[PDB]
Design a protein around this ligand. Sequence first.
Ligand code: TDE
Ligand code: CO
Ligand code: CO
Length: 355
Amino acid sequence: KVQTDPPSVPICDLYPNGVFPKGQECEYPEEKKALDQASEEIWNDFREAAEAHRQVRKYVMSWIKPGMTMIEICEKLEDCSRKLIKENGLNAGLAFPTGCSLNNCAAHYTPNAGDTTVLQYDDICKIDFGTHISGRIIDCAFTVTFNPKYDTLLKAVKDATNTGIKCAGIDVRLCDVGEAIQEVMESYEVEIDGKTYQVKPIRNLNGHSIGQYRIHAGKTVPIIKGGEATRMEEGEVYAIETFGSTGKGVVHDDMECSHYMKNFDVGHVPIRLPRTKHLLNVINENFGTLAFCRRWLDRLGESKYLMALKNLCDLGIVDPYPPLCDIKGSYTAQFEHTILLRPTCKEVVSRGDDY
Ligand SMILES: CO[C@@H](C(=O)N[C@H]1CC[C@@H](O)CNC1=O)[C@H](O)[C@@H](O)[C@H](O)/C=C/C(C)(C)C
Ligand SMILES: [Co+2]
Ligand SMILES: [Co+2]
């Protein structure tokens, strides 16, 4: 069987023998082959999630248009993602909420219930969403625009992200990747509405290592120089993402929060407060240590849960991730891919024919 025009066939049903397509395999900048084959089932899970990501985003690009509300966009994307990944509790599903951050806002924004925001012709929207199979997460993102005036800014960030991807590798120092990304990013100048700007990396936003059910495993991939000389290791998985801005090149928390995620290091915590106890149970059952958003709690039939959620945040059990924005009037863009540092090569597992 093949995929229907508007995708609806699970990726696992498109692949009979349970063997999924590899991403772009690259040479780094025998026994290791045996070691690589030993984790084949893991690489395969990443590939299944990546193929779902590729097919979902291809679909999104065909219909996303100004006039649609941000809620309509996210619900349409998420519905497709759930169907192609063949959602099954914590064994297969959405790794995190659909980011659709607009203009000066660079990341971590998704609408909460009631949000009336409508996508505009001049908007620059960062679609950042994730999929996973058995906790093997694909963190991948692109930027959507309708006005050609942002073309060079988008190209700047694409080139910067690919440079970071090419520089990445086993034994490579993280600070070197950041320095490389920055020199490419800043080599671009753009003109938007009569004003010129030297593209600037958003210095306090970074790429990161990825772990099972842990989007932010512990290591950071900076996008500017001056970072840590810590090195990348064999077997690690990384999200290489870069952000370019026409503003200050720095983001701050802004707007209402929609994203939340349980602190991975916090262990079991007995709670007697009834509503707070119930919410934590709902989170443990449906998300575990994966991120979620308010719309996802509404979907599960939960209501009047905001105070319970605040309690979990105040207790440090859950962490809030508010939208991150540059100054008013600035424009930000993002591109991101997930890479596997396999023993025999580097695989840009989420690479597509689109980006
Ligand atoms: C700027 O957004 C990325 C991010 O924060 N990176 C982190 C990386 C780990 C530490 O260095 C803290 N600083 C960061 O910028 C995210 O990983 C997103 O790419 C991802 O899609 C969203 C994840 C959440 C946790 C909000 C669901
Ligand atoms: Co992302
Ligand atoms: Co990321």
